[PDB]
Amino acid sequence: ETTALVCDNGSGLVKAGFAGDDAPRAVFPSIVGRPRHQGVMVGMGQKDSYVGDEAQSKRGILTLKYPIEHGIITNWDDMEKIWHHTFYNELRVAPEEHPTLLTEAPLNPKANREKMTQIMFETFNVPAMYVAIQAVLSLYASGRTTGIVLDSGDGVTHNVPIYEGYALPHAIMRLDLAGRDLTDYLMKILTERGYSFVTTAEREIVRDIKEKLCYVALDFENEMATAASSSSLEKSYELPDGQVITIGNERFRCPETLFQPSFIGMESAGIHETTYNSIMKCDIDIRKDLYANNVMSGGTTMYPGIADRMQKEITALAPSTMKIKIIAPPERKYSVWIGGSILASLSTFQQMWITKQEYDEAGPSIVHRKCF
């Protein structure tokens, strides 16, 4: 009859679709462009601002803003433009008619959840909605009731252990390393080889280079010695104008910064050693079952060899006699959406929704008690 909308705000991609189907039918970058140059021609259809695939198409003349930085929504009018575009232009469905399910990272400020509810009820008039933790949804997607989720998109990285369907909130970790701040580093190392990508439009090109050519070394010192000692490792890529650029050790050297955040000047350990510290914060009965399932989720885990590097150094840190297993389905970029698509369709979930009546009675406050 009526089937929930499932929308994942993320950073970078918005991905959205109807509950109970196989893959998101709208996916596009969450990016708002405003034109910065003087417009010369008259009678043009020239437009206030552009969203998503429009802004990618015209990006040479636009300034591009991301309205979400480290899973926190920083600008609200931009975000409303992105949601408006999602429902009317991408899905072409009136939000009065469909419950909505919205996704978020853990330990981010409560004002984010409050204002994200207030906008959905008051401007869209969505009849009911819910806000869900990204990591939880990856287990629904991967068919497990137990595991430690390692999740990284653009923006926030976080670990959440889950055991038999119970969360373990004191062990949750959050890390700001992933995905954007890899690219902002890749621009600086490419400057060392004599290319300068400064503008916000050039950043999208560096992001595409990162998606195509980077990979994680099994041993970081062996491959730096090798690529110092050869050109065998070295690959060249064609910029949008037809120039060609050649990239050597920089291509493995960039995603290594996930495992040694001191490269960009962070304090914390890398993803393997927050994963291990997260399992260490759990009680000793469960640990054998957390080591047996590590579910990797979100796009920044897509680099080739990131699973095998994870398995190798966690096996170095772990006690010798337990199997470490890393689970990394090729789907994983969409896991959070697929998990939400399953969850929003369960019959047992239909009592969970915040309904408009409860909001009208109790105000934006309700979200914190009812959700998570």
């Binding site: 930085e69 480290h70 926190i72 920083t74 400020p109 700001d176």
Partner: peptide, 7 residues
């Protein structure tokens, strides 16, 4: 964010 960070 609000303090310990730019967002």
């Amino acid at each position: 964010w609000x303090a310990x960070c730019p967002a």
